[model samples]
Target: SQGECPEGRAYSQDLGKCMECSVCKNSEKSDFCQNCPSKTEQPDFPWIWV
Candidate 1:
């Protein structure tokens, strides 16, 4: 559970809650945060689900 947190979220041991990645909101390249899941769609490629 500690390491299974989502890409945009982190697991807190004391709080024991999934915390959103604050780095992303603060800036793009902050520590371990560079990019996140696209809310729209991937471009310059194909999606089978389409």
Candidate 2:
């Protein structure tokens, strides 16, 4: 799986594929990836987990 992506790019588990880091369209903080949620991916019920 090494080198599957171009230089500086990495395999994205969230996107389920290799994509340019810039394509994420999210804010990356020193601790984590922020503001990366999509409306379609959000759960229908806030209290449900399954």
Error (Å) of candidate 1 at residue 28 is 16
lDDT of 2 by residue, 1-50 (tens): 43345543456556555545455446552221222232354445676566
Tell me the number of clashing residue pairs for each predicted model. Answer: 0, 0
Best by lDDT: 1
The true-versus-predicted C-alpha distance at residue 44 of model 2, in Å, is: 54
In the order shown, what is each candidate's alpha-carbon RMSD?
Answer: 6.4, 10.9
Clash-forming residue pairs, model 2: none
| RMSD (CA, angstroms), candidate 1 | 6.4
TM-score, predicted candidate 1 vs. hidden true structure: 0.34
Q: Which residue ranges in model 1 land beyond 4 Å of their true spot?
A: 23-50
Give one digit per residue, the lDDT tens place, for model 1 in 1-50: 24555566544555545556764574543333322333555465766675
Candidate 2, residue 7: the lDDT equals 44
Instruction: Note the residue pairs that clash in candidate 1.
Output: none
